């Protein structure tokens, strides 16, 4: 009988909700009001990197905080050297449509994918010289959305068919099939300790997963619209995400609650990417208004604007060393800030 | 060090040189998105012209054209459609014969949705009324789905082919006028709609002529001459 199942599901949802709201006493703003807010931070473009044909869509920093990779809808993947404003590698992709990019922790491997449902793995340090494909991963029914490297051997992937997977690139087999989402899974990120990861989907919700065991631990449903981007706090006890509803929110994994919401009266556009600085006291985000905004993470107020673009910003990232910021956009130019 | 700096600079020069040549080819080629209902006769039309997205490469009078089919992608399309914002032209296929559903109404709603999207406004659409012969043979009721058909009449400027029954002309022109109205309702951006009837290997020339008009209208608009 479906009616009794609906009744028990909704009453258990009510139990979840009332427990969650009973576990709360005050907001983070009320407790953190005491500290001195950070003064308005000026940001400048220290260099501009050019060469893409059109509409960069993804990028990711390297652990060295010097090299970075980016792709564009032309099918080209470029590796840059921030300190010398030079490019070192270029990859012609077999498919003209791209959706994500990833950078391995050790820098030995780089991965990307798109609408072809196939995730390609590239070995930069090939003994034959130049650069060649190491393996091609397939099995998703929907388009690949985003992927990240747990290490040099394991890669996690998400797709627009409610399925998220973990791959052992040596085997090329889907080792685990994370399932439970209702719609397309957009973005995901890995915790600093690599013990857990979260993913946002087109369900106004985000979920936490166990890499080893494979089941979902808990879900957050603070937002009112589809989740577009998600990122972790510099420590694994919190994470933040943005949505197309023109709001940004911070969640705590241990508290299992919505801690803060970022919004403004003069913004009517969604968010494409978010990131944190090394200390976690500075949160950066990109918006459809051709500019990026930065908030004092612990005070919930704007501290600066990065208006160096003239087209939709599609990706954003912060170095592991916390020394600079980079931003890609739908125009062929990307800006680096410090 | 000087040696590695020079090596990096010459590598950058090499990559730029090997990139420009591809850049020219990419700029010269025009990409076309093929869209429509699964059972709307897409197979016949793609056979006429000739893993997720399927791609086909063909040549017409020294102009390179790429057609991308939705293929195996999930029915939900609100996300990945925005990726195609830079296509030269969208070719829309709809079966005018209309079954399990009111196919024509769903096609109209999808056309309106893709027409009024804030990202797609910069891209025009080419509309093909497929399966016209099948529609003619089957009609030889549109009333129930479209009550207005009980009073609509063929426009005075119509040019029916010899041997065509007046009812077929009335039906086809009514269906065309529905899309024309739902398209001209907005008329705000660079987008346009170029309806066509088909049954027809000539459709390649039809698409080619529309593509020339789309590129012409763009350059003239940039100069603000139109």
């Amino acid at each position: 009988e479906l009616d009794q199942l609906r009744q028990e599901a909704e009453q258990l949802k009510n139990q979840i909700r009332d427990a969650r709201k009973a576990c709360a006493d005050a907001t983070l703003s009320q407790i953190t009001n005491n500290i001195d807010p950070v003064g308005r931070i000026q940001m400048r473009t220290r260099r501009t990197l050019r060469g893409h044909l059109a509409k960069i869509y993804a990028m990711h920093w390297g652990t060295d905080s010097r090299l970075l990779v980016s792709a564009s809808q032309d099918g080209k993947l470029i590796i840059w050297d921030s300190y010398t404003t030079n490019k070192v590698h270029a990859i012609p992709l077999r498919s003209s449509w791209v959706m994500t990019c990833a950078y391995a922790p050790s820098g030995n491997y780089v991965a990307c994918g798109g609408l072809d449902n196939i995730c390609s793995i590239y070995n930069l340090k090939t003994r034959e010289g130049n650069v060649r494909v190491s393996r091609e991963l397939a099995g998703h029914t929907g388009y690949l959305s985003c992927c990240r490297f747990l290490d040099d051997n394991q890669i996690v992937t998400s797709s627009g068919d409610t399925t998220c997977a973990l791959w052992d690139i040596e085997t090329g087999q889907q080792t685990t099939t994370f399932t439970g989402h209702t719609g397309d899974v957009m973005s995901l990120s890995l915790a600093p300790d690599t013990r857990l990861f979260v993913s946002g989907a087109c369900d106004a919700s985000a979920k936490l997963w166990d890499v080893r065991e494979g089941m979902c631990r808990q879900t957050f449903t603070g937002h009112e619209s589809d989740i577009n981007a998600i990122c972790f706090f510099p420590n694994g006890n919190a994470f933040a995400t943005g949505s197309d509803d023109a709001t940004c929110r911070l969640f705590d994994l241990r508290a299992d609650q919505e801690l803060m919401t970022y919004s403004h009266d003069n913004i009517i556009c969604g968010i494409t990417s978010v990131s944190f600085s090394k200390s976690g006291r500075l949160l950066l985000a990109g918006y459809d208004d051709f500019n990026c905004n930065v908030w004092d993470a612990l005070k919930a107020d704007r501290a600066g604007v990065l208006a160096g673009h003239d087209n939709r910003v599609s990706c954003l990232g912060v170095t592991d060393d916390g020394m600079a910021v980079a931003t890609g956009s739908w125009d062929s130019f990307l800006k680096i800030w410090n | 060090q000087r040696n590695e700096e020079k090596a990096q600079r010459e590598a950058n020069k090499k990559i730029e040189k090997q990139l420009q040549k591809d850049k020219q080819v990419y700029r010269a080629t025009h990409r076309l998105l093929l869209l429509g209902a699964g059972e709307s006769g897409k197979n016949t039309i793609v056979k006429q012209m000739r893993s997720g997205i399927f791609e086909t490469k063909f040549q017409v009078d020294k102009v390179n054209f790429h057609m991308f089919d939705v293929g195996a992608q999930r029915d939900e399309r609100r996300k990945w459609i925005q990726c195609f914002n830079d296509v030269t032209a969208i070719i829309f296929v709809v079966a005018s014969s209309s079954n399990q559903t009111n196919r024509l109404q769903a096609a109209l709603k999808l056309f309106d949705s893709i027409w009024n999207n804030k990202w797609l406004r910069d891209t025009s659409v080419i509309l093909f009324l497929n399966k016209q012969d099948l529609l003619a043979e089957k009609v030889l009721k549109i009333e129930d789905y479209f009550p207005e058909f009980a009073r609509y009449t063929t426009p005075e400027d119509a040019t029916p082919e010899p041997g065509e029954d007046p009812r077929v002309t009335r039906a086809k022109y009514f269906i065309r006028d529905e899309f024309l109205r739902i398209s001209t309702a907005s008329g705000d951006g660079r987008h346009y709609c170029y309806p066509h009837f088909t049954c027809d290997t000539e459709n390649i020339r039809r698409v080619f002529n529309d593509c020339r008009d789309i590129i012409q209208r763009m350059h003239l608009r940039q100069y603000e001459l139109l």
Partner: nanobody
Amino acid sequence: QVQLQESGGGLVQPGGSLRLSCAASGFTFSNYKMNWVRQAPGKGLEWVSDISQSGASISYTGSVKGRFTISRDNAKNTLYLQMNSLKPEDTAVYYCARCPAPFTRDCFDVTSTTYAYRGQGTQVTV
């Protein structure tokens, strides 16, 4: 979280009239375009009617044109749909559907299956 509710179904004799209602919570009701979608037995989902954010613009499917009437009231974040002169082929499961993104005119995937922002449906028989 985004959730929807609907009610007002039941058995209505042919030639009668009945009213449908839809309720929502957890989001800014006034900022989202809405739709009505039905599912006849052994048939796919079909669009019925839609209205703008302020309720100014309005449209219907040609089958129910002139017969159906829709209304909205943002003051209490509820959606209403009225039908009259029912005939046998009007029977179907009716879904209250929200458009995906706010502050927009387009509405993609409303009739598509597995759409996350649709209600459980309401049954009507003749």
